[PDB]
Every structure is written in C-alpha cells, then in structure tokens.
Design a binder for this molecule. Structure first.
Ligand SMILES: Nc1nc2c(ncn2[C@@H]2O[C@H](COP(=O)(O)OP(=O)(O)NP(=O)(O)O)[C@@H](O)[C@H]2O)c(=O)[nH]1
Ligand SMILES: [Ca+2]
Ligand SMILES: [Mg+2]
Ligand SMILES: [Mg+2]
Length: 166
C-alpha cells in the first residue's frame, strides 16, 4: 500500500503534537510537554485507497533547529502550523518554508498552511492574512482546533492529497 511521509513543523507551542495526537489517537492533550522528535504511524483509507500515514512530530523549540535538515530531507509533505493567537508563530512560518525549499531544492514542495487553535477567541492572525501567505506559496490554508477536532482530518488529508497532485 502507499506510504505517505508527513512532517509537522512550526514554532513552539502552536499545537503540533496536539494536532498529531488528535488525528492518530482521537483525544486532546491539554498539557504542554515540548517535543524533541516523535514518530506516529497509522493505516487509513483516503479517497477509497488504503494508505499508511507516517507522521513525524517535530520540535518547535529553536534549541533543536539543527535536526531540521535531516527530517526535511526525508519528509514528503509538510504541515506548516502556526497558532491564530500567536502572531510571532505566523511570522515564523517562512523560516520553516524557506528551509524546506532549500533542502528540497524546489519551489514545488507538498505543503499545507495550518492556523491552529481556531477555538480560541484571542485571534491576532486574521484568516485573510494567512490566506495571502498561502496564496504566495500556491498552497492551501486550513484552520484547525486540536481541542475540538475541527479541521484536523481535513488538514492532514489535504496534505496527503497534495503529495498526490505532486
Ligand atoms: N485551545 C487549544 N489549545 C491547543 C490547541 N492545540 C494545542 N493546544 C494547547 O497548546 C499547548 C501546546 O501544545 P503542543 O501540541 O504541545 O504544541 P507543540 O507545537 O507540539 N510544542 P513543541 O514545539 O514544543 O513540541 C498545549 O497546552 C495544548 O493543549 C488547540 O487547537 N486549541
Ligand atoms: Ca486530555
Ligand atoms: Mg510537540
Ligand atoms: Mg493585526
């Protein structure tokens, strides 16, 4: 069966682990344990096709930035996550995308931009601001809440589907 190698990236605390754990294990992680680098795998049917999701949950803490090249070499598609209540995390998205593009030596890398924590009302990144950034990349923008599950499957499955247009 087809295996898809997904990598979840973004600034510390934007909800990468919570997003991944909600997809794979169907519960919300309320506590904040910073990640170094974890792996998850799951068999899912997407558009009538059985496939294996291999998901790498990466470190947002800048301390582990040296590990980025290795996983950007391996990953097939990148979920680029910021939190809609954390403008700096939105501003940090580009540093992840620029490096993925260098490492891949390509402008056409399967990616989805994700504005997470859309359940929270303290919004400082407006959806239109993120839409404009996604448009410049030529990639989808999808808002999510790892807490309520809104958009969680859509974001990951859209990323699968971008690796398939590729
Ligand atoms: N309300 C709300 N809280 C969320 C959401 N996603 C994550 N959080 C909360 O935000 C905190 C950080 O979550 P986490 O998933 O660990 O972020 P991270 O991006 O994995 N951090 P790191 O880069 O250090 O591994 C946790 O307390 C988590 O419960 C969301 O969609 N909504
Ligand atoms: Ca919980
Ligand atoms: Mg984490
Ligand atoms: Mg503003």
């Amino acid at each position: 069966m087809t295996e898809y190698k997904l990598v979840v990236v973004g600034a510390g605390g934007v909800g990468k682990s919570a997003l991944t754990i909600q997809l794979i294990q169907n519960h919300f992680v309320d506590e904040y344990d910073p990640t170094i680098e974890d792996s998850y795998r799951k068999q899912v049917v997407i558009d009538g096709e059985t496939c294996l999701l291999d998901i790498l949950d990466t470190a947002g803490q800048e301390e582990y930035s040296a590990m980025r090249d290795q996983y950007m070499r391996t990953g097939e598609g990148f979920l680029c996550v910021f939190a809609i209540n954390n403008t700096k995390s939105f501003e940090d998205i580009h540093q992840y995308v620029e490096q993925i593009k260098r490492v891949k030596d390509s402008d056409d890398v399967p990616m989805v931009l994700v504005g997470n924590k859309c359940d929270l009302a303290a919004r400082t990144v407006e959806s239109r601001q993120a839409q404009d950034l996604a448009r410049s990349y030529g990639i989808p923008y999808i808002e999510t809440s790892a807490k309520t599950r809104q958009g969680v499957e859509d974001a990951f499955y859209t990323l699968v589907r971008e690796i398939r247009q590729h």
